[PDB]
mmCIF file of C-alpha atoms and ligand atoms in Angstrom:
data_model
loop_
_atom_site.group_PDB
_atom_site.id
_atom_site.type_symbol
_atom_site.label_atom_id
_atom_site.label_comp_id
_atom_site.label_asym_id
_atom_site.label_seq_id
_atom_site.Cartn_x
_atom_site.Cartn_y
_atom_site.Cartn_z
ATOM 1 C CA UNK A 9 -33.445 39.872 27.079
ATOM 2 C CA UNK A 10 -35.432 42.992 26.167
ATOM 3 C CA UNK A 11 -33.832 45.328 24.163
ATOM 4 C CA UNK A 12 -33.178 49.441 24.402
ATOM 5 C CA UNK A 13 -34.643 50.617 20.992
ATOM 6 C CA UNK A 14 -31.236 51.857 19.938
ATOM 7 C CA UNK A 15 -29.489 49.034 21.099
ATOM 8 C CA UNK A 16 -30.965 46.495 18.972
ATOM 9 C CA UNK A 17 -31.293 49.138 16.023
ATOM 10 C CA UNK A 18 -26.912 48.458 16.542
ATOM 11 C CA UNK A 19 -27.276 45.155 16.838
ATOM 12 C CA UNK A 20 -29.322 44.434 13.418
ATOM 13 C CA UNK A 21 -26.921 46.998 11.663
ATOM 14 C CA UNK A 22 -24.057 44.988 12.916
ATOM 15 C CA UNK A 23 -25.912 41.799 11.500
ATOM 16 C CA UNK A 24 -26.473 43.188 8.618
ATOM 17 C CA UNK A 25 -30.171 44.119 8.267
ATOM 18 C CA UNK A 26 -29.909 47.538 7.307
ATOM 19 C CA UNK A 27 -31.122 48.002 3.511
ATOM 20 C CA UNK A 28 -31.433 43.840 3.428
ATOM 21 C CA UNK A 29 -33.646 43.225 0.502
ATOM 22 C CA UNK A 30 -34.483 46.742 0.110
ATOM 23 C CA UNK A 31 -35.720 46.944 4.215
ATOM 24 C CA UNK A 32 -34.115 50.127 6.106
ATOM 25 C CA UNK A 33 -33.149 49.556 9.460
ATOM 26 C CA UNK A 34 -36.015 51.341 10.846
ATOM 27 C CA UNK A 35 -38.346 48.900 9.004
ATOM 28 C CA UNK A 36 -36.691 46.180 10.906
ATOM 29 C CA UNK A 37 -36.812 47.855 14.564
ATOM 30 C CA UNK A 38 -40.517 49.087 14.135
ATOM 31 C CA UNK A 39 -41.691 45.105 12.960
ATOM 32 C CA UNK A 40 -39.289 44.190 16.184
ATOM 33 C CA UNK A 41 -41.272 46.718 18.671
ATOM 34 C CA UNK A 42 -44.682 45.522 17.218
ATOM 35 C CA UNK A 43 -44.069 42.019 17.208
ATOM 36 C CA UNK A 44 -42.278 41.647 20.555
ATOM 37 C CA UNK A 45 -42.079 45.044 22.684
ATOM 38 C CA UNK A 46 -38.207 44.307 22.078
ATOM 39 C CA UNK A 47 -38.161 41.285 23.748
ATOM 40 C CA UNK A 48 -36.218 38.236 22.765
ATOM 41 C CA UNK A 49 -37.662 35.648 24.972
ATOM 42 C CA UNK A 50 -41.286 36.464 23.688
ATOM 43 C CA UNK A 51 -43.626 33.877 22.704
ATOM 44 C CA UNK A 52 -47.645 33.661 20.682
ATOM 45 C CA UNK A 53 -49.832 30.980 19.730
ATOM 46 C CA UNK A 54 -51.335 30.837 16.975
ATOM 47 C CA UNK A 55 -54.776 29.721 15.995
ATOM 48 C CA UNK A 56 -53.401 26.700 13.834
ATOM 49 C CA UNK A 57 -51.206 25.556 16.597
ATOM 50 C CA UNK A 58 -48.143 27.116 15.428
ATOM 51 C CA UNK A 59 -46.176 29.059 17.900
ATOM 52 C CA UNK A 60 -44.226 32.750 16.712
ATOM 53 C CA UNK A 61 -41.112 33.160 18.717
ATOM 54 C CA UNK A 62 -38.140 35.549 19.285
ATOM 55 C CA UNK A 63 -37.869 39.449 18.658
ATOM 56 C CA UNK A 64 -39.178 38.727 15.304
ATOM 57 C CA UNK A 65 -42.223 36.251 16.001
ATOM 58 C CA UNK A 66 -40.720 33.699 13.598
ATOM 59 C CA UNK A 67 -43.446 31.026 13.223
ATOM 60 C CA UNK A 68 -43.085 27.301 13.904
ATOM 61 C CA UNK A 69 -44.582 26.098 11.027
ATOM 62 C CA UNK A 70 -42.454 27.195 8.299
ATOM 63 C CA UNK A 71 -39.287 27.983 9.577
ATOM 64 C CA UNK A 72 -38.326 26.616 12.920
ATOM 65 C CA UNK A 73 -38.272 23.165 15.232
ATOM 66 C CA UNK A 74 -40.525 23.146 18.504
ATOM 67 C CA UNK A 75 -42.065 19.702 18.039
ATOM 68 C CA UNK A 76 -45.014 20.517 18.624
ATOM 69 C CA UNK A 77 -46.465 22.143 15.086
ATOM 70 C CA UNK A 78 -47.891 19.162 13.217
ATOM 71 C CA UNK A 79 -46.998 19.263 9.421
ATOM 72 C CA UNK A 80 -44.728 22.038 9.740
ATOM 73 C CA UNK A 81 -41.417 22.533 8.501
ATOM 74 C CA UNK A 82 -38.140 24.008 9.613
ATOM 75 C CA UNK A 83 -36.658 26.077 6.607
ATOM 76 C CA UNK A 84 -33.955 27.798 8.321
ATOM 77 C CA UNK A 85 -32.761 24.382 10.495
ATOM 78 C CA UNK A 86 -33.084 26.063 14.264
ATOM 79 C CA UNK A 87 -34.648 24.856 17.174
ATOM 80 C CA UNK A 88 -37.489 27.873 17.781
ATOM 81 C CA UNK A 89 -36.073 27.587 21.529
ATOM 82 C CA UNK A 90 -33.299 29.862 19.362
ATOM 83 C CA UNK A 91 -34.940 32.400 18.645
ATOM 84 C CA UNK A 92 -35.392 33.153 22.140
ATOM 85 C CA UNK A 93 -31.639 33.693 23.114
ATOM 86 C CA UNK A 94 -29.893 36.936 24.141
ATOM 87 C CA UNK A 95 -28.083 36.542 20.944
ATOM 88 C CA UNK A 96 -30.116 37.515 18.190
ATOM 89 C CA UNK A 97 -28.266 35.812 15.684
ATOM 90 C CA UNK A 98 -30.317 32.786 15.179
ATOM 91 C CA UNK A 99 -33.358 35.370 14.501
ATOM 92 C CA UNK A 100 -31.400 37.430 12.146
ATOM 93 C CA UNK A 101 -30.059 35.182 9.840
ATOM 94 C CA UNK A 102 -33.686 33.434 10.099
ATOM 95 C CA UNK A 103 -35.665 36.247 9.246
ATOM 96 C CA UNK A 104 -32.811 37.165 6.209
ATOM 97 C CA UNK A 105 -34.249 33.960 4.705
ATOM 98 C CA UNK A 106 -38.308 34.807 5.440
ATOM 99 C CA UNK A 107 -37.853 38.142 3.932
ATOM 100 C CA UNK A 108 -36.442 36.587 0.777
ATOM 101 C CA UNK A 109 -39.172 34.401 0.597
ATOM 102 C CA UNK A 110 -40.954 37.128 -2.179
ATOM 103 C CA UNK A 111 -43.300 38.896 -0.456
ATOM 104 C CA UNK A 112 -40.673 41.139 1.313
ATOM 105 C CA UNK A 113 -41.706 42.056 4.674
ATOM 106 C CA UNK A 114 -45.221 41.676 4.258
ATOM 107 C CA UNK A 115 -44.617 37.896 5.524
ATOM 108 C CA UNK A 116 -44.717 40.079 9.324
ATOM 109 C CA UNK A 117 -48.164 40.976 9.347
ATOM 110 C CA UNK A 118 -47.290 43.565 12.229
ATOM 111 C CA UNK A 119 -45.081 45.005 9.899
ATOM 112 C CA UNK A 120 -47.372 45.588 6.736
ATOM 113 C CA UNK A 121 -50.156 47.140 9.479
ATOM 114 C CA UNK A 122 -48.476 49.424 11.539
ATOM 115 C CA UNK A 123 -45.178 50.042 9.884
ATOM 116 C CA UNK A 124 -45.438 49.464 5.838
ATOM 117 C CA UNK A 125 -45.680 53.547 4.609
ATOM 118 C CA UNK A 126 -44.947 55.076 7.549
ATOM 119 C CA UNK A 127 -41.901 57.313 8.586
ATOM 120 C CA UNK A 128 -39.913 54.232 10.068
ATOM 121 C CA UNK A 129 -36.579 56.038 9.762
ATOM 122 C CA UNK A 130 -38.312 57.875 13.226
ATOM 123 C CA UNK A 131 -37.503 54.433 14.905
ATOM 124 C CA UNK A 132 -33.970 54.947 14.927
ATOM 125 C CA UNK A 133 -33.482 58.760 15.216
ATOM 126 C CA UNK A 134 -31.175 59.785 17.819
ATOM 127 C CA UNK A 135 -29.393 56.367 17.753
ATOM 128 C CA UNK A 136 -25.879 56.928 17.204
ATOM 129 C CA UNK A 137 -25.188 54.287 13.905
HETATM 130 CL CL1 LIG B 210 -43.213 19.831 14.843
HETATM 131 CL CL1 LIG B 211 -39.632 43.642 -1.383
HETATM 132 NA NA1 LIG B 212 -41.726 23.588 12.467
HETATM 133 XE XE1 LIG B 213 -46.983 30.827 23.713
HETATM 134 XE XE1 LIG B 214 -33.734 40.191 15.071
HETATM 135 XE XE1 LIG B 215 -22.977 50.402 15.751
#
């Protein structure tokens, strides 16, 4: 499913990732446009073998199950397969855990080099709340 920008601005809120750890919505919505164009069923490889998935790009080898990421580990007990649903549930509650890991959102590299400083509140303006 891809996501209207104020739609899944709604949807986090509703999850509760507004303000989580410190992280206004907007931070969460520009990291989600970056890292998958608002799409849930999008998908990377990484160099190491690890795959990112979901609206989020969580990565295989720390925090979800794919079976195919060799020494990895699946903190936050989820098949990566969902993080790719319609429901973005698994990847909330997922990426609550990542950004509590202590470096904040920095752990989305998207995030710390195109939206870390910026006016992020800009990503949902006009998005009725
Ligand atoms: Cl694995
Ligand atoms: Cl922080
Ligand atoms: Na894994
Ligand atoms: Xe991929
Ligand atoms: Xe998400
Ligand atoms: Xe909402």
């Amino acid at each position: 499913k891809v996501f209207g920008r104020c739609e899944l601005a709604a949807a986090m809120k509703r999850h509760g990732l507004d303000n989580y750890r410190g992280y206004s919505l907007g931070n969460w919505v520009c990291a989600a446009k970056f890292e998958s164009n608002f799409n849930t069923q999008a998908t990377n490889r990484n160099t190491d073998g690890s795959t990112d998935y979901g609206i989020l790009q969580i990565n295989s080898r720390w925090w979800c199950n794919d079976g195919r990421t060799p020494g990895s580990r699946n903190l936050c007990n989820i098949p990566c397969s969902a993080l790719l649903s319609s429901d973005i549930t698994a990847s909330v509650n997922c990426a609550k855990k990542i950004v509590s890991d202590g470096n904040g959102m920095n752990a989305w590299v998207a995030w710390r080099n195109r939206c870390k400083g910026t006016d992020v509140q800009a990503w949902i303006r006009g998005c009725r709340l």
